[PDB]
Design a protein around this ligand. Structure first.
Ligand code: 587
Ligand code: 587
Lengths: 107, 107
């Protein structure tokens, strides 16, 4: 499933409602800590809308449990990411993904 | 140890007292460029009291010698930061840290 280990607190009340835009800063890494991507390097946060086919299942369930301002370690099991087909390039098959996500704001 | 590089000229006179609240803004990155945190992006300045063990050694000493209004680049050595274990998911062990901290004001 999708794991959520909170490390930094948000407001603990405002959770993204289905249909809102999420502005997050993340760092995705392989099970062995290999940083494969990071929005913090591009200095541009990732803006995705909740509900529509925009994020891998893990992100859909994970972020939905987060509150504005919170930062957590999402450990997404293979079946909730790509796993099967994997992802040409940096995501090998049946890979467990760890995401350091900081929910910046909800619009 | 810890190196302090005065980026912006501060007050030159007002320095933090053991017990006061330092209101700062900062970004954190590693020697290899990679950033890992930024209060500026989340629009919420970091507040902490000096000498109350609310922050790591580097910040404790490095900030203690920063006058108000001053913006400095802190080059904290692992033993003053998280030398032994680092910080799970975000900081690796033995890593040296670079902090762009701006002393906004005191409380
Ligand atoms: C430019 C394109 C466009 C990409 C952008 C907007 C970029 O700007 C953003 C910043 C993405 C990054 O670009 C640097 C980069 O970020 C990663 O590094 C990453 O960190 C990541 O994991 N992210 C991104 C952050 C949210 C979680 C996850 C994601 O959700 O990303 C989404 C993703 C990659 C989903 C897979 C697509 C293929 C499906 O498989 C299918 C499904 C249907 C299919 C086929 C084939 C035919 N059909 C019909 C295959 C998979 O289904 C499990 C799901 C991604 C955001 C898409 O929604 C949108 C895009 O495609 C990815 C490792 C690879 C990704 O792209 C490099
Ligand atoms: C609970 C969440 C709480 C978080 C908040 C309130 C957030 O709002 C604030 C804005 C922090 C940020 O959250 C986005 C985030 O900021 C970083 O990104 C960062 O930039 C950083 O480096 N910062 C923060 C800015 C000041 C300097 C430094 C710090 O000082 O941060 C402090 C820190 C991380 C100290 C370590 C604590 C454990 C000790 O281990 C010990 C030591 C002694 C011990 C034990 C166990 C028993 N004893 C006696 C364990 C380590 O010992 C070297 C030192 C941080 C402010 C903690 O005081 C309080 C928290 O962690 C960290 C990379 C990770 C941290 O998120 C976590």
């Amino acid at each position: 499933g999708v794991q959520v280990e909170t490390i930094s607190p948000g407001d603990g009340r405002t959770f993204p409602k289905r249909g809102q835009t999420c502005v997050v800063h993340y760092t995705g890494m392989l099970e062995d800590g290999k940083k494969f991507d990071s929005s913090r390097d591009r200095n541009k946060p990732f803006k995705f809308m909740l509900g529509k086919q925009e994020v891998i299942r893990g992100w859909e369930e994970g972020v939905a449990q987060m509150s504005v301002g919170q930062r957590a370690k999402l450990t997404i099991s293979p079946d909730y990411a790509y796993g099967a087909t994997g992802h040409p390039g940096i995501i090998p098959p049946h890979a467990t993904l760890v995401f350091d996500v900081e929910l910046l704001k909800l619009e």
